[PDB]
């Protein structure tokens, strides 16, 4: 699954926003336009076993085209989002199976 941070004409959103995946798939985030972006996991809706400090990204990023990877493996749901662009409504969610 590939996600693009930022719209293709003027909009800050996680595109796609929410989507399910198989417990063994790779999730690569990609900067499409609107950097710098940020990704963190709310330790309030994350399973009580998958630490959110390892899948989060406390390190901002301002590289055009830069990308990151994440591979969850616990059938459930994880809520992530952007702290800087949280004023617009930039959020993220993944339902693993």
Q: Which residues are annotated as a binding site?
A: 37, 82, 85, 90
Cβ neighbours of 94 (radius 10 Å)? 22
- The single residue among 55, 70, 82, 96 that binds Cu ion, judged by CB under 5 A, is 82
Q: Look up residue 54 and give its two tokens.
A: 């390892």
- Is residue 46 within the footprint of Cu ion (CB under 5 A)? no
Size of the residue set binding Cu ion (CB under 5 A): 3
Distance CA 74, CA 97 (A): 7
Per CB under 5 A, which region of 23-31, 37-45, 63-71, 73-81 contacts Cu ion? 37-45
- Is residue 92 within the footprint of Cu ion (CB under 5 A)? no
Q: Which of 6, 27, 31, 37 does the annotation list as catalytic?
A: 37
- Is residue 31 within the footprint of Cu ion (CB under 5 A)? no
Distance CA 8, CA 24 (A): 29
User: Among residues 64, 89, 81, which one has the least CA distance to residue 12?
Assistant: 89
Binding site for Cu ion (CB under 5 A): 37, 82, 85
């Amino acid at each position: 699954a590939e996600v693009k941070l930022g719209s293709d004409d003027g909009g800050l959103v996680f595109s796609p926003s929410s989507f399910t995946v198989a417990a063994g798939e790779k999730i690569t985030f990609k900067n499409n336009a609107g950097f710098p972006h940020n990704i963190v996991f709310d330790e309030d809706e994350v399973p009580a076993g998958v630490n959110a400090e390892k899948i989060s990204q406390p390190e901002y990023l301002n590289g055009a085209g830069e990308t990151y990877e994440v591979t969850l493996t616990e059938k459930g749901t994880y809520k992530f989002y952007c702290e800087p662009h949280a004023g617009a409504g930039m959020k993220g969610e993944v339902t693993v199976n």
